Amino acid sequence: IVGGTASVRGEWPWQVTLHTTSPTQRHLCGGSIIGNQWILTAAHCFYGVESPKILRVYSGILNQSEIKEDTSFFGVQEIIIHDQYKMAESGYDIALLKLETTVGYGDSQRPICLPSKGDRNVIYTDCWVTGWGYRKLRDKIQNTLQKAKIPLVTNEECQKRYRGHKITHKMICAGYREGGKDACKGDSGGPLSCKHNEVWHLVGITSWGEGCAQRERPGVYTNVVEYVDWILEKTQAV
């Protein structure tokens, strides 16, 4: 996260850190708890990931230093990537992780509401991007979960900013015209959380951008409202 500040413990209890153990254990991506055995994240996180056996989901984490060999995590039973996904820049950048065991909800770990279909017309003015990602292009994963408040950008304005890309309504952009605050390397897969009527909603999934927090280069997020039926198809399968 560029231009952000340290989160406080329990502030983003749906935020997870997804780790890979191959070749050595390290933070891979962010993710969000959406159900008691379900993590929503970005499909691009699994590039070259050949098996869910190398994955570890840690919830209730503020500091990466809380994670050692004796730290409890959730194993991943299954990786579900959207069928239409090719690459982050073309959209469908969404994946679900089916956990091997269930998350016990509490003040340190709980789910974030998915957006409502009727809320496709609501204007969100209180949106935050969170993660342990870089503070600039050439940096390192941060110990403390960072947060940055960022305004949503219309599809029309985002398209003007990304000449040569096709910015679809399945993407949602966020950033200041002058830049300064954004997601960066290591933040992808994490949430873009927006508070509306005192309830937090998972509006976006951190996906891609041209550099980090650059002037007139908003961050591009998977527009979660456009995938609610796909999420229910995969999580509510009979």
Binding site: N36, P111, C113, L114, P115, S116, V199, Q236
Partner: peptide, 6 residues
């Protein structure tokens, strides 16, 4: 949440 996950 309005949208419910089982």
């Amino acid at each position: 949440c309005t949208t419910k996950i089982k």
